[PDB]
Amino acid sequence: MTLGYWNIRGLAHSIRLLLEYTDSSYEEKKYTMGDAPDYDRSQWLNEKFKLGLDFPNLPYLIDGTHKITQSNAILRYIARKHNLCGESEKEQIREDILENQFMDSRMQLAKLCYDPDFEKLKPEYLQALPEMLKLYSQFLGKQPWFLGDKITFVDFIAYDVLERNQVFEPSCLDAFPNLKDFISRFEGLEKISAYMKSSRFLPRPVFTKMAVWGNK
Amino acid sequence: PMTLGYWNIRGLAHSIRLLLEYTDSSYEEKKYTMGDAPDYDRSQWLNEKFKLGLDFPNLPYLIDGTHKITQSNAILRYIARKHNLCGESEKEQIREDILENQFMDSRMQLAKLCYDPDFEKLKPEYLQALPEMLKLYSQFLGKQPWFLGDKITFVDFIAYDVLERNQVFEPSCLDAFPNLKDFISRFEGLEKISAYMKSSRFLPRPVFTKMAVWGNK
Numbered sequence: 439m440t441l442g443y444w445n446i447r448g449l450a451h452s453i454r455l456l457l458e459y460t461d462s463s464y465e466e467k468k469y470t471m472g473d474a475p476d477y478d479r480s481q482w483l484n485e486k487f488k489l490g491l492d493f494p495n496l497p498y499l500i501d502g503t504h505k506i507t508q509s510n511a512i513l514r515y516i517a518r519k520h521n522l523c524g525e526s527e528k529e530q531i532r533e534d535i536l537e538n539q540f541m542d543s544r545m546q547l548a549k550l551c552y553d554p555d556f557e558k559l560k561p562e563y564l565q566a567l568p569e570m571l572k573l574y575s576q577f578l579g580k581q582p583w584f585l586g587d588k589i590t591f592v593d594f595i596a597y598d599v600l601e602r603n604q605v606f607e608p609s610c611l612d613a614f615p616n617l618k619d620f621i622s623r624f625e626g627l628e629k630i631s632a633y634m635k636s637s638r639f640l641p642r643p644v645f646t647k648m649a650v651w652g653n654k
Numbered sequence: 655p656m657t658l659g660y661w662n663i664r665g666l667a668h669s670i671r672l673l674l675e676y677t678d679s680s681y682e683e684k685k686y687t688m689g690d691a692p693d694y695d696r697s698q699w700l701n702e703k704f705k706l707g708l709d710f711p712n713l714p715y716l717i718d719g720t721h722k723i724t725q726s727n728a729i730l731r732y733i734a735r736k737h738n739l740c741g742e743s744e745k746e747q748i749r750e751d752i753l754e755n756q757f758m759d760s761r762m763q764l765a766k767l768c769y770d771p772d773f774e775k776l777k778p779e780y781l782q783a784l785p786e787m788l789k790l791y792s793q794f795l796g797k798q799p800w801f802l803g804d805k806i807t808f809v810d811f812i813a814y815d816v817l818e819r820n821q822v823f824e825p826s827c828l829d830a831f832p833n834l835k836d837f838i839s840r841f842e843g844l845e846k847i848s849a850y851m852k853s854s855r856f857l858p859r860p861v862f863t864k865m866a867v868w869g870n871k
């Protein structure tokens with residue numbers, strides 16, 4: 439099993455954490471991006487079209503005969519294999535909603551951090567952020583996990599998005615104990631804890647070299 | 655009984671509307687009208703956004719009895735699971751997932767272009783990049799009638815919208831790809847689709863919101 443991605447956190451964080459939790463056997467291919475102004479992508483470009491991928495992209499997962507692209511598709515593949523999915527209709531709906539909701543959240547932060555105008559844009563982001571966090575908080579309520587009593591793939595997505603907001607602005611979650619408690623819970627999982635004490639753990643840089651925030 | 659909420663445009667509800675039609679679903683639409691520039695008034699929505707019991711209030715939304723769903727893809731999946739319009743084998747599920755997200759990327763690229771003040775300048779570039787993404791969809795589809803194989807599924811609804819709106823942007827974009835052109839025809843030719851397309855309820859334009867540079871009307 440091989441995981442391909444840039445040498446940064448980005449869209450692979452959740453996948454890495456999931457492979458770890460699932461005691462999956464895998465190897466990473468980690469491409470290096472260059473700096474400004476050329477942002478050299480040589481190693482990736484020389485192999486992008488040589489992997490058998492239907493829609494070449496980063497991240498990618500090669501598992502035996504299956505070749506997958508699209509972060510969410512990759513997460514879902516792993517998830518289905520390890521019974522880490524919503525089961526009831528209601529759980530599936532929630533799963534679907536959150537998967538997409540969290541992608542919107544991811545992207546709002548990414549759009550900010552890659553905008554030349556970052557500093558003029560930040561306070562807006564930060565003023566808006568509590569509103570979204572609040573919805574997440576209220577959704578989660580007193581459940582340990584997003585779907586209920588059981589951990590599922592979306593919690594991996596949730597962790598990444600929420601935690602990185604905490605890294606962006608360390609106080610952002612202060613108004614939401616259940617979200618702080620969620621992060622702790624995630625981090626406290628045996629496997630997660632042990633990963634986190636390994637050299638493979640890759641929490642930063644959050645974004646690519648092209649970012650204005652998180653490029654380092 | 656079921657209620658579909660969205661702005662009074664094509665946008666992200668096109669695929670949903672077409673799926674509800676195909677499935678002979680009983681539904682009503684709640685159509686919100688955005689105001690024109692420069693204010694782009696959102697009050698019609700905003701006045702009820704937080705009164706619908708939605709966990710994460712947004713457009714589009716689907717109210718189905720006691721299920722309250724937001725997120726376009728979630729809505730599609732919900733409908734699809736009800737009507738056997740999903741991938742079944744593991745391999746089918748993988749492909750469904752990939753395409754769902756791939757077409758979202760495609761959708762977003764076109765929207766980014768279409769809402770950029772630099773549209774004019776940026777268009778040729780989009781047009782130059784387009785056959786490469788379109789080729790990948792053509793390759794993927796191959797000789798299959800539908801994206802997952804011999805059975806129509808939700809992703810074909812997404813595919814239709816994305817591909818067809820590219821054809822609206824640039825009518826010749828699909829020329830090099832017989833299979834894609836045939837896919838379009840086939841989708842359009844589905845009984846319930848064909849009929850809907852002839853109705854006064856069909857809403858193919860405007861493509862985007864009032865704030866768009868292109869497709870605003």
Ligand SMILES: CC/C(=C/SC[C@H](NC(=O)CC[C@H](N)C(=O)O)C(=O)NCC(=O)O)C(=O)c1ccc(OCC(=O)NCCCCNC(=O)COc2ccc(C(=O)/C(=C/SC[C@H](NC(=O)CC[C@H](N)C(=O)O)C(=O)NCC(=O)O)CC)c(Cl)c2Cl)c(Cl)c1Cl
Nearest residue numbers: 448449496508509542545548665712713725726758759762
């Ligand atoms: C780490 C940084 C990262 C780079 S990773 C490296 C890169 N890979 C890569 O990009 C892979 C991405 C892929 N998708 C994946 O794997 O996941 C790489 O190097 N690759 C190698 C090569 O060689 O290529 C990074 O920066 C990054 C980059 C890209 C992306 O994602 C790309 C993308 O396009 N993703 C799809 C969109 C996902 C997220 N969606 C959104 O954020 C919001 O979506 C939309 C918003 C508006 C909009 C419209 O204009 C329509 C308006 S509708 C009315 C509106 N409702 C909504 O907005 C609802 C949206 C919701 N999601 C839904 O679907 O329902 C409204 O009025 N609402 C009401 C209200 O009150 O709010 C127009 C009609 C549209 Cl169309 C959309 Cl889609 C990512 Cl993620 C990252 Cl991180």
